[PDB]
Amino acid sequence: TYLDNLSITELNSTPEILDEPEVKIPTDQEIMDAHKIYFADLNFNPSTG
Amino acid sequence: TYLDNLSITELNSTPEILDEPEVKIPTDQEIMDAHKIYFADLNFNPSTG
C-alpha cells in the first residue's frame, strides 16, 4: 500500500474545567474535642445543700 | 336482816401525796450514736466554686 494526501485540521473548542474556588477549608474534626476547659456558674439556694 | 351497825363516810382526804415517782436515772453509755441525723451550716462564695 501507499497513500498520498494527508491533512490535520482544527474543528471545535473542547470545554475545559475551571471549578476551583480554593476548595479546602481545614476543619480537622479531631481537635473539636480539644477544648477540655470549662467553667461552672451556679446560684446558691438557702435552707438547702 | 338485823345488822345493828352500818355506815358510810366521805373520805375526802385524798392521798395523792404519794411515794417517790422517780426511778434510778440512766446515763445511756452504750450507744449514744442514736442521732446520726444532722444538718450542715455553710455559705457560698461567688466567682469561685
> Cell match 474556588: residue?
A21
Residue A1 CA: distances (Å) to CA of A4, A5, A7: 10, 13, 18
Specify the resolution in Å.
Answer: 4.5
Backbone phi and psi for residue B3, each to the nearest 5 degrees, phi listed first? -120, 115
Rg (CA), chain A: 35
Residues tagged in the binding site annotation of A for Ca(2+) = 4
- The shortest C-alpha distance from B32 to chain A (Å) reads 26
Query: How many contacts does A have with B, using Cβ atoms within 8 A?
Result: 7
* Residues of chain B with a CB closer than 8 angstroms to some CB in chain A: 40, 42-44, 49
| Range list of β-strands (E), A1-49 | none
- The shortest C-alpha distance from A38 to chain B (Å) reads 12
